[PDB]
Ligand binder design. Structure first.
Ligand SMILES: [Ca+2]
Ligand SMILES: [Ca+2]
Ligand SMILES: [Ca+2]
Ligand SMILES: [Ca+2]
Ligand SMILES: [Ca+2]
Ligand SMILES: [Ca+2]
Ligand SMILES: [Ca+2]
Lengths: 331, 331, 296, 296, 296, 165
């Protein structure tokens, strides 16, 4: 109900202690399309964490984390499943919505941005974030919306790890924030879309395969399949291996290390082990399998999982698959 | 005046720092009735005090404190006077209204309840208070209302102290609260009613008479007349007598004690002495008369008035009458 | 055939920064919508025990704040028609569900579940494929918040049909752990007031957590050389008198308590301390009113 | 308004030569027709505890023989509109109730009671003028019988409406007697499973008589120097295991028993023998199912 | 269901200068309108005893003079719907009542009471909140008069429904006083022909006052060393023969008398004089006809 | 109670190596309630020390109990549904011999094997024709000593995700 505000003459503006909006589940609509099907739907992305210094994407350094492609589950938790089934996609309507979850007492800037080039570097300064053509800025306690005008180019879901992603993605969503304080988030981000899918195909596959010749270099790798991680997410240095799954959800991992010896498997950052972890160590080679739940929020100093005190690490081959916790290993 | 709220898109909800509503005096309306008269009126009840643990009726342990009967001045400060004059009553409309008197910063639950059985025990747990058919729950800073649908049974004003009150009362109002903090009340409770009175009669009487044979038992009593107190309100134990008038207002008291000796009369809880207190002590018997003002809010450890250091207490006979402070004794 | 309508309190939502589903309780059926499930139906179970089958006609979950307007975060309310599906782990998954609602902790919220026409069995405690005996499961979540003071309370309001009068299932829960075998695991029979993880039995302490609001009568019999003190430093308060019998080798305590239902990870609903050589815990918990509390 | 339909067992009629009412129990209104009276409504009470008010719509009492066709006697089943009226003692009186039914002990019989339109209060708040909150009282009488072979069983069958959901009244009964003060008298709260006379504390014995059919959970706490044996020598069998804690000064027993309800004047439902210096009895009884019986 | 219409005599109104309610009888329910109340229903009680509940359909009180036109003052007739309300003490209070009528002692008068639709219980003798079992109370008053000769007679005329045939309540009254304990107080059972104050037991005399018109059969058994004479110097006359048995320690008298019903403060209905060491009075009074009087 | 019956086909009195014909399903199917992805993983767990038969299977049902043979110093796993699968198998056993692909499946890319005293682990992805074989499993592990436990994870996937040499 509307109330009268004490001490205001007509046409005044007021600041309340907090602003909100109810969000309700809405089942996806299926619509007529040039291709196989058009889906009109709405998905939660992430919560904007507060930071004093300017940070983008809650601190995730991966370029194109929220690349607009149906096969990117960092942006589409559900559409990923749908992407599996088709070759090509076209976004028809695209908008990003910000709902504050903090009081009007909270300081800071929340910027919701879209960059047409999904491979462009993340901005770091206040001039940069303000200079995007497709931008929307607000106080963290205010509602906001960014409408991205779509084109009519069909693109491939990148299920073959295209190197020049920009040509298969419809740009990238990103958000930035500064001059905030406290432990709790500013507000929530949603994507609302209308998307067409073109060509039915065999399921693309939910597995990610990572392979690094550490003996060649502690950096670089081959990554095939779903892009749950990027190269920089796997740290192999100084007798430690750290793997950062900075996309939320549940994942099955099998990691096989070519190394003389290894120490403990620790879960000391954004993830928790689910059920039992299966570890087999030998002279020259080790293997670990387990399934974890990740909050997906990036951590500077503590990986999703780490392997400690590792000696003469020559090679990392690993397999990561989004899955159900039901499938965890037993004690 | 209505103001625009900064940072809200259309259809948002907002929390202000505080919500209120003006209350104004409205003289009672008198209306056509099957009986003698129908009164449409509105009366203040009490203020909901905050408490962490679940408390009902600001801590008053008396079952049916807010029993719905026109002769109960705990619920009807004014209708009590009107009840004096008639035999029978019927409520036609009945509603209870909560106005917050605290900011939207205050925590807790305020529950306004009605139990059709006025003799039912007070609830103590969160499941119980939530399970009443006629309930209304809110945050302490929000408005609330409970509408009780009336029946068309006539009942007697209980002016002869019916033992099975449920058959003469139209249930009982009660309120409960939990997870609150601070010294100040959450909000105010009003009763709004339409009530018919049936049969003109000689004034019922404003006096309450209490009599306990302490020599028989320190508990139990005979109470006749207006029910300002219940048995448990008069404590007679361990060389102390404590009387708890846990209904607000001004009362004339005459208390006559059969006891060898008594000490001091103290006013150390919810009441203040008005004018002078008249005390007469002898060997074997004492008498005190005075008039007090009571806030009526129950106190666990300090009675409305107490008599200390009392020896071989055999009998308490007392008379309590709601009255005017004008009638207090002189120095 | 027998038509019941009611509204009843479920649980208070504790604030949390990270996502927390069902106040941190990990179990998959916690709030399966079946009238036997006293964790969801705090009031209805008392009737459910007398009948064989149920069908919900109307069903909605309500959230009423008990916190201040300056509390941050969100409270999600959620219904999955598959009562065996795993709990969601991240906030985005919650939005994948068809039937959910989400709001500020300081705002009232509601979630209406559209009911079907199928009858299902009242007892689900034997049943393995519980989805076939439950009308889905309710879940709640919260994130982006802070504080010890609960955000608000959840309630269920429904119109339900019951079908066949039966011998009463009873309102008592019986717990049994052979602690000499293991400090975890147990046989629990009757109503689900507690689950294994709710009885902590370690380091010379016994704590039991009744994380369902109400008033209960308990009797714990302890196989142990000696025990120390019974304490109530958590979500429950002793009602009336506690009756304690201690001997060399065995102890029995019986009392009625009043639980707030809200889980506390530091202090149990009741605890018994300085417990020496605990071999066995056997216990009885029964929802009741405070009128039957023991006297001093 | 909630409409309940059910039929349930009350008590067995024991043979008697002289005219005896209600198997010799002298309590007026023992079978008062109020759904919270568990002596009459062995099943309904479970549902009754959830509501404030009741109204019977249909009400009938049946007698079904369990004796042979050569058994002599009269079985009379009766209803008195006033639940506070004295029990009859004479053969003119028992035949003079408006609502009557008479038969040989080997013949089935039915008594229909035409219901009225008055709502009455359910809750036991120790109403003094019980007649004003009961729908009369059922009673039975018998004469000209011989031996101890029960003639047959009594059942009640009915349609009731219930009105106002409320906090549960509970299914617990608690009994407290200060034997220090007197061997008779007590405080009893909650469900009326037992009256004062049903608990016997004399001559170094404790007998409790649960003379209402069903399965019950009992926990009893004795203030006494020492106690002998728990025995089940009367109308009840122990179900599963009995948990016993003895110490000097106090002891506690818990167990589930299964009672026939048939009164035995020489053997109690359960007894504890060789009890030395009994000071106090505090006990808790609760109707339940056999599933919650303690384990071996 | 059973529909009775009748008119019957209640009491004669004695003149009084000061206000006198109910001929000076102080008791609050004296004329409670309940068919069991033989002080009001001198005739109806004989039927009331056979039924459980009543409802008045028409009800009026009549006053017919028996005095002369030169008698001063007024006779008030009065109905309070609350049968537990105190008697009025001053004339002005009488006029506060909604249902009263007032006239000269030499004039016929009537008071019509509008009846309701509610059924209430025939026995009120157990009941504590008697207003819930009575259809109010009748009262009469007189003031501003003089003389020993009664002003006129009061009558009740009604149409009443009775509901359930029951075992007879009986027409006998049993009185019992342990005079060795106290010269006042008593146990009285059955019909209310007398109340405690009606049996005077002091100074070596026994007087009993039957201040309800009719013919009665009495039996008094006296625990006393010796007794003197039975006399009838008040409102009653011996009918037929008096049967007197005297012994050392105990006496029994049985006789039927005819009472005018009008109270006499100097002479009782019957008296027994020169009574030595009275320990106990036990007595039986039964309304009857004169045909059963004892013979010489 | 969750399936709409079962399709099945039977045949007799045939000869030769080649198939008779092809089977298609044609359907119209409604889906009711959107939900988070169910998961593509199958998890198999057998306490061989308890019994050589029986197991816990959670997730997608690519295999049934009888498809995993653990007896006589051999482990055989039969994936008798066509397609490509990622496998991680962890064996509690003193020692193991060779991993062989001798039935209806072919190894894709490289197979990763780690053996120790008391425990072994193998990961690889295979292509299965899914046609059942009586005597040669999809993959087998030979000469296995004191097999106590099999825990395994099977996921339908793309061959693109195979391990490198
Ligand atoms: Ca493709
Ligand atoms: Ca393709
Ligand atoms: Ca009155
Ligand atoms: Ca009156
Ligand atoms: Ca009767
Ligand atoms: Ca109630
Ligand atoms: Ca689901």
């Amino acid at each position: 109900n509307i109330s009268y505000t004490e001490g205001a003459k007509p046409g005044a503006i007021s600041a309340p202690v907090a602003i909100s909006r109810r969000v309700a589940g809405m089942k996806p609509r299926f619509v007529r399309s040039e291709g196989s099907v058009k889906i009109v739907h709405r998905e939660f992305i992430a919560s904007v964490l507060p930071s004093n210094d300017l940070t983008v994407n809650n601190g995730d350094v991966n370029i194109g984390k929220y690349r607009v492609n149906p096969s990117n589950n960092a942006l589409f938790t559900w559409l990923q499943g749908q992407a599996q089934l088709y070759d090509m996609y076209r976004f028809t309507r695209l908008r990003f919505t910000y709902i504050p979850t903090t009081g009007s007492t909270s300081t800071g800037r929340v910027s919701i941005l879209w960059d047409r080039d999904s491979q462009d570097p993340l901005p770091i300064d206040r001039a940069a974030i303000s200079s995007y053509a497709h931008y929307a800025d607000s106080a963290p306690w205010a509602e906001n919306v960014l409408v991205v005008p779509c084109d009519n180019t069909w693109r491939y879901m990148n299920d073959t790890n295209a190197v020049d992603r920009k040509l298969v993605d419809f740009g990238q969503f990103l958000f930035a924030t500064y001059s905030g304080a406290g432990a709790t988030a500013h507000g929530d981000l949603y994507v609302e879309y209308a998307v067409e899918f073109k060509d039915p195909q065999p399921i693309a596959g939910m597995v990610c395969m990572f392979d690094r010749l550490v003996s060649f270099s502690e950096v670089g790798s081959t990554i095939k399949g779903v892009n749950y991680i990027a190269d920089r997410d796997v740290i192999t240095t100084g007798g430690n291996i750290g793997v950062n799954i900075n996309i939320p959800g549940t994942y099955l991992v099998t990691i096989v290390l070519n190394a003389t010896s290894i120490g403990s498997l620790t879960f000391t950052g954004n993830s928790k082990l689910v059920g039992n972890s299966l570890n087999v160590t030998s002279s020259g080679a080790s293997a670990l399998t387990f399934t974890l739940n990740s909050t997906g929020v990036p951590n500077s100093s503590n990986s999703s999982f780490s392997v400690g005190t590792v000696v003469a690490l020559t090679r990392v081959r690993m397999t990561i698959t989004r899955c159900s916790p039901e499938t965890a290993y037993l004690a």
